[PDB]
Amino acid sequence: TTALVCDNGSGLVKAGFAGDDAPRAVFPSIVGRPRHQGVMVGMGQKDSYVGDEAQSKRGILTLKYPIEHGIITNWDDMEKIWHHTFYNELRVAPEEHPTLLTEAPLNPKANREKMTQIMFETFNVPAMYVAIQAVLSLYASGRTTGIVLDSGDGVTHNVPIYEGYALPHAIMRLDLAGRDLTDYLMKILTERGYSFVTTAEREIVRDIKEKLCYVALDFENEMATAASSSSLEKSYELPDGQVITIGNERFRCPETLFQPSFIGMESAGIHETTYNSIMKCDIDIRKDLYANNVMSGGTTMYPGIADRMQKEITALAPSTMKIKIIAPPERKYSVWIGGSILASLSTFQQMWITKQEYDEAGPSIVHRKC
């Protein structure tokens, strides 16, 4: 019939048909369960909440993410999310559609085998495929050469590609992303006396982060600007109608991407990780990688992120190299868009893992076909 493209991110689920220009269903990758006595009539009869229903009813629920750092840690809740995706948001029979899934690089092999087994046995898809998220982000930009910086909710990774060839020894991965930035914002918000401690309040802090945070082009004078003046301060309204105000935390949160030591990590920032990924590549392709720095994922949506990466890589390049960062407005769906592109190509239709292939090699067939 037609292929399904499900980009199971850490924080959000992107799904839809191949050939469409945007995911048809975009909902949080969460499962909610009640945490209070059944004092309201009719409300206690439903034991689990999956999509936006869990988010809208989060005041009486405990929210769990089945994927952490791009790894599926709860498989039963992941199946709840997959059933919700296919039968409630897309309303399709998976037995009729080949399904294209995504994954981060340097992931455990069992994650890919278990999702292959789940699609073939629980959903009985006719065929399926697992693609690398950064490669799909390259497909979305219409390029065959360039280094991709992908940053979603759980994982930050760099993948350099030249003329359609990856350099695996130069692939970088960092377990620092949007969820870690939200947790850091939660920690620094206590300096002003705000407290957020439940999983529901974590979603509130995530909304605050997505609305008032930005990347400083220079952190030290922004720190001085916020220390002297009030012009950086902005207000936010809580669900009970209380109003909070932040000035300094707006850029101190995203600075962790460039300074992971704020959360005790020894690792270098995303700019140094990109530069080191380029320097692991062959010297004859470095000029073309410097001119093609592709940004992808929701964590790359901060205002000023591309300007700061431009400034930092320029500070690292040999000056003669023309540093270019590519940051399309659709960055939030570059992985899904690339997946719909790939699943639409006729040259790809032989690349599917069919169920018959899986019936011979088992779940390990995914390591050979993908």
Ligand X SMILES: Nc1ncnc2c1ncn2[C@@H]1O[C@H](COP(=O)(O)OP(=O)(O)O)[C@@H](O)[C@H]1O
- Interacting positions 116-155 with Mg ion (CB under 5 A): 152
Residue whose tokens read 């995706």: 85
Inter-residue contact 95 to 125 (CB < 8 Å): yes
Q: Is 84 in the site for other proteins (CB under 8 A)?
A: yes
Query: Under the criterion CB under 8 A, does residue 42 sit at the interface with a copy of itself?
Result: yes
Count the Cβ atoms, other than its own, within 10 Å of residue 148: 31
Check if the beta carbon of residue 292 is closer than 8 Å to that of residue 159.
no
- Chosen from a copy of itself, other proteins, ligand X, none, partner binding at 247 (C-beta under 5 to 8 Å by type): none
Q: At what angle do helices 133-140 and 334-344 cross, to 10 degrees?
A: 80
| CA 50 to each of CA 80, 88, 102, 320, 350: distance values in angstroms, whole numbers, following the listed order | 7, 10, 20, 52, 34
Pick from 314, 192, 210: nearest CA to 254: 210
**Partner that binds at residue 341, options other proteins, ligand X, a copy of itself, none, CB closer than 5 to 8 Å by kind:** other proteins
Q: What is the DSSP letter of 181?
A: H
Residues 368/361, Cβ–Cβ less than 8 Å: yes
49 binds, among Mg ion, other proteins, ligand X, none (CB under 5 to 8 A by kind): other proteins
**Which of these segments, 116-124, 190-198, 205-213, 322-330, binds ligand X (CB under 6 A)?**
205-213
3-state helix, strand, coil in the chain (%, to 5): 45, 20, 35
Give the number of other Cβ atoms within 10 Å of residue 1's Cβ.
10
Site residues (CB under 8 A) for a copy of itself, limited to 224-243:
237-243
Per CB under 8 A, the segment of 85-93, 146-154, 202-210, 242-250 that binds other proteins is 85-93
Q: Which does 87 bind (CB under 5 to 8 A by kind): ligand X, a copy of itself, other proteins, none?
A: other proteins
Task: State in angstroms the smallest separation of the CB of 174 from Mg ion.
Answer: 13
From other proteins, ligand X, a copy of itself, none, interface partner of 362 (C-beta below 5 to 8 A by class):
none
Dihedral of CA atoms 21, 182, 274, 100 in degrees, nearest 10, equals -30
- DSSP 3-state assignment of 64? strand
122-181 residues in contact with ligand X (CB under 6 A) are 152-154, 178-179
Residue 318 found at the interface with a copy of itself (CB under 8 A) = yes
Tell me: does residue 360 bind a copy of itself (CB under 8 A): no
Q: What letter would DSSP give residue 335?
A: H
Stretch of residues binding ligand X (CB under 6 A), selected from 159-167, 207-215, 234-242, 349-357: 207-215
Question: Structure tokens of 300?
Answer: 């790359």
Separation of alpha carbons 46 and 319, rounded Å = 61
Is residue 210 a contact residue for ligand X (CB under 6 A)? Answer: yes
Distance CA 308, CA 2 (A): 41
Q: Is 335 a binder of a copy of itself (CB under 8 A)?
A: no
**The tokens of 305 are what?**
């992120």
User: Hey, what are 21's tokens?
Assistant: 């220009």
Q: Which two tokens stand for residue 165?
A: 């060839």
Q: Which of 47, 142, 193, 329 binds a copy of itself (CB under 8 A)?
A: 193
Nearest residue (beta carbon) to Mg ion: 152
Stretch that binds Mg ion, among 1-9, 80-88, 216-224, 323-331 (CB under 5 A): 1-9
Site for ligand X in 293-322 (CB under 6 A): 297-299, 301-302
Q: Which residues bind Mg ion (CB under 5 A)?
A: 9, 152
Q: Which residues bind other proteins (CB under 8 A)?
A: 19, 21, 31, 41-43, 45-54, 80, 83-84, 86-89, 91, 93, 139-140, 142, 144, 163-164, 337, 340-342, 344-347
Q: Which residues bind ligand X (CB under 6 A)?
A: 9-12, 152-154, 178-179, 206, 209-210, 213, 297-299, 301-302, 332
